[PDB]
Design a protein around this motif. Structure first.
Motif, mmCIF file in Angstrom:
data_model
loop_
_atom_site.group_PDB
_atom_site.id
_atom_site.type_symbol
_atom_site.label_atom_id
_atom_site.label_comp_id
_atom_site.label_asym_id
_atom_site.label_seq_id
_atom_site.Cartn_x
_atom_site.Cartn_y
_atom_site.Cartn_z
ATOM 1 N N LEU A 1 9.601 -6.958 6.959
ATOM 2 C CA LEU A 1 9.532 -5.563 7.343
ATOM 3 C C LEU A 1 8.476 -4.916 6.462
ATOM 4 O O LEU A 1 8.142 -5.454 5.409
ATOM 5 N N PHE A 2 7.946 -3.772 6.888
ATOM 6 C CA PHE A 2 6.954 -3.064 6.078
ATOM 7 C C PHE A 2 7.361 -1.591 5.963
ATOM 8 O O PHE A 2 8.214 -1.107 6.716
ATOM 9 N N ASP A 3 6.753 -0.892 5.013
ATOM 10 C CA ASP A 3 7.067 0.499 4.753
ATOM 11 C C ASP A 3 6.284 1.442 5.654
ATOM 12 O O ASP A 3 5.070 1.522 5.553
ATOM 13 N N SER A 4 6.982 2.163 6.526
ATOM 14 C CA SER A 4 6.336 3.099 7.452
ATOM 15 C C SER A 4 5.424 4.088 6.750
ATOM 16 O O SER A 4 4.373 4.435 7.269
ATOM 17 N N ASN A 5 5.831 4.555 5.578
ATOM 18 C CA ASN A 5 5.027 5.522 4.839
ATOM 19 C C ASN A 5 3.717 4.928 4.321
ATOM 20 O O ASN A 5 2.809 5.664 3.956
ATOM 21 N N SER A 6 3.616 3.600 4.303
ATOM 22 C CA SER A 6 2.425 2.919 3.798
ATOM 23 C C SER A 6 1.319 2.745 4.810
ATOM 24 O O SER A 6 0.195 2.397 4.441
ATOM 25 N N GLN B 1 11.851 1.082 7.249
ATOM 26 C CA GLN B 1 11.405 -0.284 7.008
ATOM 27 C C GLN B 1 11.381 -0.931 8.383
ATOM 28 O O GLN B 1 12.413 -1.354 8.901
ATOM 29 N N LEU B 2 10.193 -0.995 8.970
ATOM 30 C CA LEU B 2 10.024 -1.562 10.292
ATOM 31 C C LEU B 2 9.660 -3.036 10.276
ATOM 32 O O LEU B 2 9.256 -3.594 9.247
ATOM 33 N N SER B 3 9.789 -3.640 11.453
ATOM 34 C CA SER B 3 9.546 -5.058 11.666
ATOM 35 C C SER B 3 8.144 -5.339 12.158
ATOM 36 O O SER B 3 7.622 -4.625 13.012
#
Length: 103
Positions: free
Chosen positions: A87-92, A31-33
């Motif tokens: 934050l957003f989902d790296s896998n997305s 979960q990145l910024s």
């Protein structure tokens, strides 16, 4: 957390685009910024195009568009740099298209 993934991106400044295509690395399963991502974007702009924060400020428009894996999109305005905790989902992540128009 650790294994990296290649996220392709494109840079267009006043229509000018990079010769082929480059990639960017992001940890999978994380979960990145958006702050950090926005920073990478600004890094690439300065690094590859010599685009300064001052060019971005006076720019007609400065933005980077995120394409998720499901095909949907999110446009992030760089002319409105400002703190965020989201934050957003790296896998997305599918692709990043950076677009700056000086005018």
């Amino acid at each position: 957390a650790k294994e990296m993934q290649n996220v392709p991106y494109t840079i267009a400044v006043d229509g000018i685009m990079a010769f082929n295509q480059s990639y960017l690395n992001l940890p999978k399963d994380s979960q990145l910024s958006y702050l950090d991502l926005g920073n990478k974007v600004k890094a690439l702009l300065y690094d590859e195009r010599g685009v300064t924060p001052e060019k971005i400020r006076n720019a007609k428009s400065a933005v980077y568009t995120i394409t998720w894996k499901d095909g949907s999109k999110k446009e992030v305005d760089l002319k409105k740099d400002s703190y965020t905790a989201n934050l957003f989902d790296s896998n997305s992540i599918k692709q990043i298209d950076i677009n700056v128009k000086t005018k």
